[PDB]
Amino acid sequence: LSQDFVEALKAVVGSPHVSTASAVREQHGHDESMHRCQPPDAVVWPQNVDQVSRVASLCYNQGVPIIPFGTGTGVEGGVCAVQGGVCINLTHMDQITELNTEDFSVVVEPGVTRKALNTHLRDSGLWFPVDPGADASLCGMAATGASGTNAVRYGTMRDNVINLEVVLPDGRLLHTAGRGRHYRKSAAGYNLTGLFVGSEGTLGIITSTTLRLHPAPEATVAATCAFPSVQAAVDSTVQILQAAVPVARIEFLDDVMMDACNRHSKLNCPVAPTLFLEFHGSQQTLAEQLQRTEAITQDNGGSHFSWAAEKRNELWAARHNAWYAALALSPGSKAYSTDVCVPISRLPEILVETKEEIKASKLTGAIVGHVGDGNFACILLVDPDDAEEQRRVKAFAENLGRRALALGGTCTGEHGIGLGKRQLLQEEVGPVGVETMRQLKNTLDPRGLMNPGKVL
Ligand SMILES: Cc1cc2nc3c(=O)[nH]c(=O)nc-3n(C[C@H](O)[C@H](O)[C@H](O)COP(=O)(O)OP(=O)(O)OC[C@H]3O[C@@H](n4cnc5c(N)ncnc54)[C@H](O)[C@@H]3O)c2cc1C
Ligand SMILES: CCCC[C@@H](O)C(=O)O
């Protein structure tokens, strides 16, 4: 990367906001996944959208790859600079704007996390519900198509992103639904907002997101329920969903994950396949939701509910940190995560089969999951230096993905494709789906410089 080019970057964002130092690049060459660190050639921190546009145009016209970088908490290698180039760290644009509490909407820049937004919204009676366990950039969450424990009731990012501000690869500025617009529904033209949600930085750079806000629940009750078997816990989940109980949260932990979370959070739950549950409503609604849900869990051998503001906070903090709880089982290990999502009636088959397949392997695994969506993660620890173990973990994850595809499901419910699921995506949507996706990629990024090597 030439000295003239570096000086041109500094001319846009300022000398302190460009770095070619090896340590700084290495810190931006990886995410939380096991994918090998591939450092960009430079890291740049634009201070406003005009600077994002000018950095993108400079890179694009010089043939330099662009890698958008939020908080680096992704798990599929999205920020790995597989072809080098310029990593654009977006987090210095950190302003919340256009808060419209009467319309239940707000605009956030990439440096805003969900924690920051919900802190800014306390005493408003509103909150933003989509809750990945990591303190992630909300624009990064839009880019990956994230969900969370609350999505079963309140929707994923796709459900709650109403507009996006996107710097296209050559620097043009697009407001996907129109500048300043926010509304509940539209049939106006083609829906561009949904194309950029889940695009993982391969179609453009999200520089603001317009988010749907939700009313805080009148009353909240959380609980845990221990089961004799994985089958019993997942059967309960399916029956709760088929009974249309509007649960706010329904999260599965297998016994390995329960124990890991116990050790990492000083919860003391019975070591068993467990549901973490949360219910929102009035006192009257909660009582009948609880009655109908305990009746179903009881039918499948569930324990009486162990009830949980501060004890609920500890419960969900433990759940949100499950990834780190699993990593702490074998210190020094990295890990890969699966993320399949299947039609809910097939969820018992594939979860039970996954448990059995983990047991029959010398692989260690923990299972945790947004099972209310038919989604779960298998967390597979890896010795970073054991090449034979990594091959077995990859083979396991690929076979699980293919089993989900055989059941009519998807290889990723929320994490995305990045570097790890590109072959599974080709199987999932077939040749016409792949070509159509690639045609969209090519019209927005003709030179192939917008996060190359990812998704497609
Ligand atoms: C402990 C833990 C728990 C998690 N729980 C969940 C969960 O429940 N659900 C879930 O969905 N994910 C979860 N995640 C994964 C991760 O937090 C999400 O994928 C999150 O959306 C990533 O955001 P980020 O800004 O950190 O992404 P990064 O790693 O910085 O980037 C992810 C991808 O998006 C692109 N990108 C980032 N920002 C932008 C932008 N502004 N414009 C365009 N492209 C961009 C990058 O180029 C990359 O390809 C978890 C991660 C951890 C570590
Ligand atoms: C870190 C990614 C694996 C686990 C995450 O999806 C979660 O549900 O907490």
Curated annotation (Swiss-Prot):
EC number: 1.1.2.4
Domain spans labelled FAD-binding PCMH-type: 36-216
A molecular function GO annotation: D-lactate dehydrogenase (cytochrome) activity
Keywords in alphabetical order: Acetylation, FAD, Flavoprotein, Mitochondrion, Oxidoreductase, Transit peptide
Keyword Flavoprotein: yes
Cofactor(s) recorded in Swiss-Prot or TrEMBL: FAD
Principal place of residence: mitochondrion
A biological-process GO annotation: ATP biosynthetic process
Catalytic class of the enzyme: oxidoreductase
Organs and tissues of expression: Readily detected in liver and kidney, with a weaker signal observed in heart, skeletal muscle, stomach, brain, and lung.
GO cellular component: a single term: mitochondrion
Residue numbers bearing the N6-acetyllysine modification: 10, 266, 394, 421
Catalytic activity: (R)-lactate + 2 Fe(III)-[cytochrome c] = 2 Fe(II)-[cytochrome c] + pyruvate + 2 H(+)
Presence of keyword Metal-binding: no
Family: Belongs to the FAD-binding oxidoreductase/transferase type 4 family.
Assembly mode: Interacts with CSRP3.
Function: Involved in D-lactate, but not L-lactate catabolic process.
Name of this protein: Probable D-lactate dehydrogenase, mitochondrial
